[PDB]
Amino acid sequence: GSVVIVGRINLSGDTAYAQQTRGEEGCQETSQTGRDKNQVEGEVQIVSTATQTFLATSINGVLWTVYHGAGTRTIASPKGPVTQMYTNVDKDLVGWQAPQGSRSLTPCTCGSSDLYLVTRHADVIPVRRRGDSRGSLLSPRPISYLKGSSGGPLLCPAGHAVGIFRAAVSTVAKAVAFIPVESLETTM
Ligand SMILES: COc1ccc2nc(C)c(O[C@@H]3C[C@H]4C(=O)N[C@]5(C(=O)NS(=O)(=O)C6(C)CC6)C[C@H]5/C=C\CCCCC[C@H](NC(=O)OC5(C(F)(F)F)CCC5)C(=O)N4C3)nc2c1
Numbered sequence: 730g731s732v733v734i735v736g737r738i739n740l741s742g743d744t745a746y747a748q749q750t751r752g753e754e755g756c757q758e759t760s761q762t763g764r765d766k767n768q769v770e771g772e773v774q775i776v777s778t779a780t781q782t783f784l785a786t787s788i789n790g791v792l793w794t795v796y797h798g799a800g801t802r803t804i805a806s807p808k809g810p811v812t813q814m815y816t817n818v819d820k821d822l823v824g825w826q827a828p829q830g831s832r833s834l835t836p837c838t839c840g841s842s843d844l845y846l847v848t849r850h851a852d853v854i855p856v857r858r859r860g861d862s863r864g865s866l867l868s869p870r871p872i873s874y875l876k877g878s879s880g881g882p883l884l885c886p887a888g889h890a891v892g893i894f895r896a897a898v899s900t901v902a903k904a905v906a907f908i909p910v911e912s913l914e915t916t917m
């Protein structure tokens with residue numbers, strides 16, 4: 730079956746807000762056909778397979794997500810199922826050509842230490858950068874709050890993309906792992 734856009738997250742100036750466009754019944758049927766006529770908008774898509782929901786982030790003209798969510802699946806589109814352009818399991822990274830109407834985030838060149846994880850609810854969670862692929866949460870959170878947010882963006886204060894959220898370190902989450910925008914460009 731195909732990955733399906735079921736909603737999205739829009740970044741408005743210094744804010745993010747979510748919208749739902751599809752429920753479980755529509756997700757299951759569109760996953761089967763791979764045919765999706767819904768208009769696309771936003772930098773972050775809420776995506777779903779038959780059985781898992783997660784996020785996808787547009788960067789550099791590619792809609793990126795995690796392999797552990799998408800597998801090798803196509804993504805539903807107005808012209809039917811679209812094959813992945815990029816698949817790297819070692820990076821836990823897949824990507825498809827970005828849908829017409831999504832807006833690509835700008836890769837960050839700030840070097841900032843303050844990062845902001847966007848969750849699937851448009852919650853913006855502060856994070857302290859610790860290198861290029863890890864971040865420490867300012868307040869620990871039950872991992873429940875972060876589940877379903879893989880493939881969403883870490884942003885810098887200016888709103889640029891720093892990386893794709895991959896996994897969380899926990900024992901309550903204390904830290905997060907993300908794929909740096911630099912690794913996406915190397916893949917590309
Ligand atoms: C099948 O072929 C594959 C190929 C490559 C691959 N690569 C990774 C790293 C992987 O890991 C899985 C899924 C990740 C996940 O849960 N991702 C988040 C998420 O939201 N997923 S999701 O959207 O709910 C879902 C599953 C898509 C629907 C974003 C978190 C939020 C909450 C975590 C809840 C407890 C989990 C804590 C765990 N911790 C961790 O693995 O930490 C490490 C670190 F210590 F950081 F190094 C990475 C290696 C160890 C974790 O994050 N995952 C476990 N599976 C695969 C599988």
Ligand SMILES: [Zn+2]
Binds near residue numbers: 840886888889
């Ligand atoms: Zn920046």
